Amino acid sequence: NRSTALLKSLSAERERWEKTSETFKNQMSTIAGDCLLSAAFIAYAGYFDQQMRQNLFTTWSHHLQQANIQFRTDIARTEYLSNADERLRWQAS
Q1: 44 Cβ contact partners less than 8 Å away, ≥ 6 residues apart
Q2: Going by C-beta distance under 8 Å and a sequence separation of 6 or more, which residues neighbour residue 6?
Q3: Are 60 and 40 in contact (CB under 8 A)?
Q4: What SS3 class is residue 88?
Q5: How much is the CA Rg of the chain, to the nearest whole Å?
Q6: Which of 6, 29, 76, 83 sits at a 20 to 30 Å CA gap from 93?
Q7: Distance between CA 63 and CA 54 in Å, rounded?
Q8: C-alpha distances in angstroms, 1 versus 5, 11, 35, 75, 77?
Q9: Residue 22 is inside which H or E element, if any?
Q10: Cα separation of 59 and 63, whole Å?
Q11: Is 34 within 8 Å of 54 (Cβ atoms)?
């Protein structure tokens, strides 16, 4: 059946989507500290230079660590907020 080949082709995307849905509780529980970092950056850090921005972000993250706040560490700031479409549109500009 053509449907069999279709579904077996779609099995990989099914696995992707189920794996994504599995960890939704951890995807959601960390919005607090992550948004704290991101909002502090989007408020203050626009005046500072690269070194000062990095220092200030590091201080925020360390304070969140001290306070037992759930936040992702490996997610980069632009990759955290800006998506692919915004990045590509800006690069086109």
Answers
A1: 56
A2: none
A3: yes
A4: helix
A5: 19
A6: 76
A7: 14
A8: 7, 16, 49, 43, 47
A9: helix 2-22
A10: 6
A11: no
What 8-state DSSP symbol labels residue 93?
Answer: -
| Complete DSSP assignment for 38-82 | HHHHHHTTTSS-HHHHHHHHHHHHHHHHHTT----SSS-HHHHHS
What is the rounded CA–CA span in Å between residue 39 and residue 79?
14
Q: Is 32 within 8 Å of 71 (Cβ atoms)? A: yes
Q: What angle do CA 60, 64, 69 make, to 5 degrees?
A: 150
Solving technique: cryo-EM
Q: Which two tokens stand for residue 79?
A: 């990759």
Overall resolution, Å: 4.0
Query: Taking the CB of residue 86, how many other CB atoms lie within 10 A of it?
Result: 11
CA gap 3, 92 in Å, rounded: 41
